[PDB]
Design a protein around this ligand. Sequence first.
Ligand code: CLA
Ligand SMILES: CCCCCCCCCCCCCCCC(=O)OC[C@H](CO[C@@H]1O[C@H](CS(=O)(=O)O)[C@@H](O)[C@H](O)[C@H]1O)OC(=O)CCCCCCCCCCCCCCC
Ligand SMILES: CCCCCCCCCCCCCCCC(=O)OC[C@H](CO[C@@H]1O[C@H](CS(=O)(=O)O)[C@@H](O)[C@H](O)[C@H]1O)OC(=O)CCCCCCCCCCCCCCC
Ligand SMILES: CCCCCCCCCCCCCCCC(=O)OC[C@H](CO[C@@H]1O[C@H](CS(=O)(=O)O)[C@@H](O)[C@H](O)[C@H]1O)OC(=O)CCCCCCCCCCCCCCC
Ligand SMILES: CCCCCCCCCCCCCCCC(=O)OC[C@H](COP(=O)(O)OC[C@@H](O)CO)OC(=O)CCCCCCCCCCCCCCC
Ligand SMILES: CCCCCCCCCCCCCCCC(=O)OC[C@H](COP(=O)(O)OC[C@@H](O)CO)OC(=O)CCCCCCCCCCCCCCC
Ligand SMILES: CCCCCCCCCCCCCCCC(=O)OC[C@H](COP(=O)(O)OC[C@@H](O)CO)OC(=O)CCCCCCCCCCCCCCC
Ligand SMILES: [Cl-]
Ligand SMILES: [Fe+2]
Lengths: 51, 30, 30, 34, 37, 210, 51, 32, 32, 54, 333
Amino acid sequence: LNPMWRQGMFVLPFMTRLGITQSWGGWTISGETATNPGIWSYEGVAAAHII
Amino acid sequence: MEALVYTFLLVGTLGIIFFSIFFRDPPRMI
Amino acid sequence: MEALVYTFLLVGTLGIIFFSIFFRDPPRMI
Amino acid sequence: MLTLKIFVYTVVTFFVCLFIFGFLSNDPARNPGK
Amino acid sequence: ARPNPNKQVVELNRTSLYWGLLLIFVLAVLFSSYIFN
Amino acid sequence: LTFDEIQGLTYLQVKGSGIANTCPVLESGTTNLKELKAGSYKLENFCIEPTSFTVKEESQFKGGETEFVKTKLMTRLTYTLDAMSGSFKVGSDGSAELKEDDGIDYAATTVQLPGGERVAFLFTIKQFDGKGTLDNIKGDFLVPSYRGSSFLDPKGRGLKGSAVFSVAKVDPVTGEIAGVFESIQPSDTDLGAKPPKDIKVTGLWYAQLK
Amino acid sequence: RRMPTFFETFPVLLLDKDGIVRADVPFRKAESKYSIEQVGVSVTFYGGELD
Amino acid sequence: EVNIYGLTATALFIIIPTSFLLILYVKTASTQ
Amino acid sequence: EVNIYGLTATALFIIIPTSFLLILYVKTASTQ
Amino acid sequence: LVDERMNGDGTGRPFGVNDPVLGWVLLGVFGTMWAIWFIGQKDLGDFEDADDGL
Amino acid sequence: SSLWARFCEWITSTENRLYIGWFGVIMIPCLLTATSVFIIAFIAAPPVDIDGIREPVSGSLLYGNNIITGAVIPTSNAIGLHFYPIWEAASLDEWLYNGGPYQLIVCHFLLGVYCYMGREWELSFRLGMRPWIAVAYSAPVAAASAVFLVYPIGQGSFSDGMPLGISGTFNFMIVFQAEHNILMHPFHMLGVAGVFGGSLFSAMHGSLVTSSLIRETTENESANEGYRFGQEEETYNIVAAHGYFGRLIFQYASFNNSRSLHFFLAAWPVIGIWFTALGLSTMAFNLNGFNFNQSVVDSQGRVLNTWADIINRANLGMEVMHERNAHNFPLDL
Ligand code: CLA
Ligand SMILES: CCCCCCCCCCCCCCCC(=O)OC[C@H](CO[C@@H]1O[C@H](CS(=O)(=O)O)[C@@H](O)[C@H](O)[C@H]1O)OC(=O)CCCCCCCCCCCCCCC
Ligand SMILES: CCCCCCCCCCCCCCCC(=O)OC[C@H](CO[C@@H]1O[C@H](CS(=O)(=O)O)[C@@H](O)[C@H](O)[C@H]1O)OC(=O)CCCCCCCCCCCCCCC
Ligand SMILES: CCCCCCCCCCCCCCCC(=O)OC[C@H](CO[C@@H]1O[C@H](CS(=O)(=O)O)[C@@H](O)[C@H](O)[C@H]1O)OC(=O)CCCCCCCCCCCCCCC
Ligand SMILES: CCCCCCCCCCCCCCCC(=O)OC[C@H](COP(=O)(O)OC[C@@H](O)CO)OC(=O)CCCCCCCCCCCCCCC
Ligand SMILES: CCCCCCCCCCCCCCCC(=O)OC[C@H](COP(=O)(O)OC[C@@H](O)CO)OC(=O)CCCCCCCCCCCCCCC
Ligand SMILES: CCCCCCCCCCCCCCCC(=O)OC[C@H](COP(=O)(O)OC[C@@H](O)CO)OC(=O)CCCCCCCCCCCCCCC
Ligand SMILES: [Cl-]
Ligand SMILES: [Fe+2]
């Protein structure tokens, strides 16, 4: 009932568009949790752009 | 609160009008 | 909100440190 | 974690060996001298 | 040539000063009511 | 290791490896259910391992049904209640009547949730009475108090769960009994300021009849 | 006892007519002897809104 | 509700190009 | 609750003396 | 156990080494650095008694 | 020619701007490691059980702490003096709970500042100066190592080290006064004399030299354009400054030699800081400060009170409140 586009979210539905579907908090987009976040989570993509 | 912002903007526009009229560079000759 | 202000101030202080170290005037001779 | 541990030992021992074989490599003659 | 042979100087006279300041305040006076809403 | 394989070691060899946080592994003793004589026995070293700590996440992401979620331990190797004892009858057909009185019966551990939220909870088998026949040895225990009544809140002011045993392997000679263990208990609450959470704990256990 | 100027959180005491403390609000609740629950001090109003 | 973001946006849109024009004017009128 | 006025005071105390120093530095380094 | 960890605290092992895989890296860095230094020995000062001191 | 010779020539060159040297290969990456962990952990560190009593402590900016209250929490007491790196932990959500980045940053930062002192030797030797800058830099190195290394060794836990933050520094200092009474200790008073005398001597020398600048400029422009860089003319009349000082106080407390004056400036605050650096190391091993409890006694045998007998009440008030949830047995802090 509270998707991404109700919140005014802008650059996260491009990472989710090209497949970045997991964060370091453990939560995902569809609702369940995934175990391994890997190097490439949302915060990792952001920090890589800062670098 | 915002009324002071409105009044400050109008008075600042009038002040720039004043300085533009009186403190311009003199248009000088040849 | 204020955490971004804190982080911006710390990063700006570090940036002025960086430009002060590397982009100084050269201390020149006689 | 072992993949990290090999890498940490590699970097540490590389820098320490660079240190030791730097100071064995003719240090007190790279001065302005006499 | 190690010093730059294209170091050039910006120039902005008093007429352009008054035009720019008047433009910025008129833009502010116009958009401020819609920004504050 | 087994029990004598553990006690053959000295303290200087157990110290620093994690062998101390284990039940001794029991040998081949499966399905000896007729090899069980009666008596009002006691247990020598009744140790119980956990092996998974799952928390009922009450937050919804699918519907009005919530499962148990595998998580991470947080403190360090701070589990496996030890040296428990009491009074432990074996009956006629395999009816165990197991009563726990003494020993280190409690251990306080913290556990996250995926989402970055810490939950502290006790692991207590204080004063348990399991009277059952070798498949669902049921009964309840106490969750005494998450913290003492003399606890200072940070500004200077100021139950029963479910537990199911099982029996897998039986030493016929010495009475060493292994098996699997499950339990569900509530978490810590700070006296009603935070609603509790259900926590399932699964593991093994060990005993030595006497 | 009235609060002095320096004290931000002055603790609650109850003086007699002379200056001897007869009750308190205890910071520690274990072995309290002069608590209002043990003594039984009532309050009466005079004047004001809740007269 | 008033835009507390909006008052900061107003003050920034005032001060930043004003200072930008003042730098160039003082640099210009310094020489002549 | 965060201040209504605090971020405005912070941004003003940043930007005003910064621009004041930049004007003088650009006027100085223009000549030399 | 519940989880997996090296359990290297309180052991008392030389250089904190657990695997021989972990042990070979010390020599594998030390010997190559020594070999590079021993090659670089060509362009240094080697001498009979030309000593650098008072 | 050879690779090693060219690499050594580059690393002992004096023309690259920030000098490196041979201590620099440990000074640079280790302090960059410590900085790169500290900036992350000052911003986004989860709460840390400092006490081992299952009470996490917030220290980072994201969890409701500003710049003053933000701090890197030290390691828990159950962790003790055990070396606890990342790879011995279970997860990075378990290493951060039990005081990880303090253990990493301190052990990095100490090696960093020792190799920085070695670098301050090395560049002086490479230029051809006299080598005693590192001797003066040995004082704040000792002052850092006493609170980060020596005192947690003495107390047996890395908990009682100084927390890496502004509001944590004072919670170190006040509890240190509670348990060890640092003010009633003669080394600490020597260090107070060191820092106050250092401020006095800096202000005094900077007054008496600026008060004698030989005029080279006018009175409209800056008074700092009178010194062209790299000259050979003494820009301050040190004869007139010494005459003014001798008229001001004493002629036998002269210090007419400029070099004797500079030795005195180099040796007052350094020897001032060395005695506090020893004082922390002595109080680390429970060699407590002074104690004047119940000294002034009347002719009967009753107890009178002094300022020491008020500081005893203040230290009792601190001691019965520090570490409020841990202590049960009546002593040993
Ligand atoms: C008038 C009051 C007064 C004064 C003047 C002092 C003075 C002093 N106290 Mg103190 N104190 C007082 C009252 C006072 N105290 C009271 C009332 C208490 C009781 C609460 C204490 C409790 C107390 C404690 C508990 C301690 C002191 C210490 C000290 C000394 C600290 C100076 C020092 O050594 O730093 C020297 C410099 C450093 C520590 C910094 C080292 C520099 C590092 C190595 C490099 C910095 C790296 C940095 C990040 C790089 C920056 C990079 C950036 C620019 C980009 C100094 C003599 C300390 C001490 O003994 O000193 C040794 C100490 O531990 N005091
Ligand atoms: C948020 C802002 C809100 C609006 C505020 C008002 C608008 C400010 C915009 C800038 C004002 C104009 C600046 C450029 C023109 C100027 O420099 O004059 C140039 C003149 C004549 O030019 C020169 O003057 C020289 C002679 S003399 O100086 O005039 O005597 C002479 O040498 C030369 O020939 C001649 O060219 O001389 C000056 O140098 C005087 C400078 C005065 C400018 C400072 C104004 C800022 C303060 C005003 C704020 C008012 C506050 C409220 C008051 C109650
Ligand atoms: C909210 C702020 C937060 C902090 C932001 C960072 C601090 C900004 C403070 C000002 C920076 C320093 C300005 C003064 C020094 C300077 O002018 O350099 C002087 C140098 C060398 O001097 C000269 O240079 C000439 C050669 S050359 O230009 O260098 O090639 C030469 O002719 C001459 O001899 C020599 O003297 O050359 C320049 O002219 C370059 C100017 C660049 C300054 C612009 C900086 C503003 C943008 C930075 C913002 C970063 C944003 C984030 C980036 C990811
Ligand atoms: C994945 C992890 C990411 C980590 C990211 C790490 C970011 C930090 C990197 C540092 C970047 C800033 C320095 C780079 C500029 C520099 O090299 O100077 C420019 C000069 C020019 O050198 C000249 O450089 C020439 C090479 S070049 O052509 O100019 O490139 C050379 O030919 C010539 O001989 C020489 O004179 O370099 C030198 O003088 C020495 C080079 C090494 C010195 C830089 C490291 C020192 C930094 C201090 C570290 C402590 C700080 C603690 C934290 C606050
Ligand atoms: C025909 C060749 C055409 C190549 C076109 C490449 C265009 C540039 C792409 C760069 C961005 C890569 C995209 C992210 C890629 C990425 O995210 O990888 C991700 C991965 C590292 O991340 P992880 O392993 O943790 O994966 C995440 C998951 O495992 C965790 O859930 O990298 C690899 O393991 C191998 C990658 C190889 C990438 C090769 C590129 C580098 C070599 C290229 C040299 C080409 C030279 C050609 C000369 C003719
Ligand atoms: C993102 C972070 C960076 C942000 C940067 C800050 C923002 C920068 C904003 C730049 C503002 C530029 C404006 C300068 C404006 C300025 O100074 O003009 C100056 C310029 C004069 O050019 P010249 O040919 O005369 O060159 C000689 C000198 O005068 C210029 O150096 O005029 C123009 O060329 C056109 C520009 C618009 C001018 C005519 C528009 C008239 C609008 C009048 C509005 C008032 C009446 C309203 C009626 C209701
Ligand atoms: C638990 C036990 C712990 C033991 C710790 C042992 C620490 C060892 C410290 C050694 C210090 C050596 C000091 C420098 C020694 C030195 O000054 O080098 C120089 C020296 C030769 O010097 P020269 O240049 O004068 O040689 C003569 C001619 O070259 C003259 O032109 O070489 C040696 O003697 C090496 C001695 C054995 C060094 C160890 C063997 C190195 C190779 C082993 C690596 C195997 C590679 C395997 C590849 C995977
Ligand atoms: Cl205790
Ligand atoms: Fe001086």
